[PDB]
Design a protein around this ligand. Structure first.
Ligand SMILES: O=c1ccn(-c2ccncc2)nc1-c1ccnn1-c1cccc(Br)c1
Ligand SMILES: [Mg+2]
Ligand SMILES: [Zn+2]
Length: 313
């Protein structure tokens, strides 16, 4: 109980900031996650031995893919940490427990392929889970690891609290299906603008947590430009591989996934910022004002992609 995790001074300070990059030292990422759980949730939330065993089994079940890997899991959990720490009083004890774990586990066993590719390939998972295919798999993997001997980090919760936290985790992971984001944000936009948004309404809380999950999931676009630009390489490395696999199925992939069309990436990034990222952080900042730095950073990166198009870099 008296064993605190402590980071070097630069990490101790910068980990509080939304634009923090967890760095290239993979062996520091478990410690970074435990540090965040301890400060976000408490030193009492989890048995350290169980938490450490859970974290290391989660790591093992992320694959060696360019983007949807262990570093993405910890990066998304850090963005959730920053949101929770900047909104101290808004979230319940169970939400703080659930949401860092949901973020760490949200892409478990990702292969670097979209729901669309799994459906066109006729992958077994597409028959098991007709919608939100990979997201239902990610939740299934989370439950599998939680049920390994000595991995049940929630063991001190009551039957009803345990059911509640696993329901928070399921909804949070399903919400990372970007197909579901468009309608979720539109409903949240209407609720905020007509003033009907009510954080005591459980169905409203679910929507706000969904948008937080999208915001954390896309948080690569809220980093300093050099991080955002280099992460884009990893994102498109996966898109281009999926494009190659579409071509192997005898299907011309969309331009975004076609490596023959790299010239179109800058304009594609603009579309993504304007259609997905900026609207996401705008609605999140309206509902949770202290998350405004994510929107500011997103807008800075939009401006950088406009400079790339104008040949200014
Ligand atoms: O730069 C991007 C360009 C396009 N798309 C995208 C376009 C349509 N459908 C899905 C993704 N996402 C990104 C992006 C930026 C940050 N994260 N992601 C991301 C990547 C894969 C998957 C999920 Br979820 C998110
Ligand atoms: Mg995902
Ligand atoms: Zn993700």
């Amino acid at each position: 109980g008296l064993m605190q995790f402590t980071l070097p001074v630069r990490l101790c300070k910068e980990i509080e900031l939304f634009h923090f990059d967890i760095g290239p030292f993979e062996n520091m990422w478990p410690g970074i996650f435990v540090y965040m759980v301890h400060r976000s949730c408490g030193t009492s939330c989890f048995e350290l031995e169980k938490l450490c065993r859970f974290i290391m089994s989660v790591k093992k079940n992320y694959r060696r893919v360019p983007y949807h890997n262990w570093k993405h899991a910890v990066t998304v959990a850090h963005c959730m940490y920053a949101i929770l720490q900047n909104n101290h009083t808004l979230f319940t004890d169970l939400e703080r427990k659930g949401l860092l774990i949901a973020c760490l586990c949200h892409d478990l066993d990702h292969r670097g392929f979209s729901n669309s590719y799994l459906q066109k390939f006729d992958h077994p998972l597409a028959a098991l889970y007709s919608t939100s295919t990979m997201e239902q798999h990610h939740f299934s993997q989370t439950v599998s690891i939680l049920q390994l001997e000595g991995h049940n980090i929630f063991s001190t919760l009551s039957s009803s609290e345990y059911e509640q936290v696993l329901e928070i985790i399921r909804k949070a992971i399903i919400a990372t299906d970007l197909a579901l984001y468009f309608g979720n944000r539109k409903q949240l936009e209407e609720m905020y603008q007509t003033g009907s948004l009510n954080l005591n309404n459980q169905s409203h809380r679910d929507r706000v947590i969904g948008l937080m999950m999208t915001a954390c999931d896309l948080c690569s676009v809220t980093k300093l430009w050099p991080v955002t630009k280099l992460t884009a390489n990893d994102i498109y490395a996966e898109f281009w591989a999926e494009g190659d696999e579409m071509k192997k199925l005898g299907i011309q992939p969309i331009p975004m996934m076609d490596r023959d069309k790299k010239d179109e990436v800058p304009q594609g990034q603009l579309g993504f910022y304007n259609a997905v990222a900026i609207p996401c952080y705008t609605t999140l900042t309206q509902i949770l004002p202290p998350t405004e730095p994510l929107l500011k950073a997103c807008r800075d990166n939009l401006s950088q992609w406009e400079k790339v198009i104008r040949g200014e870099e």
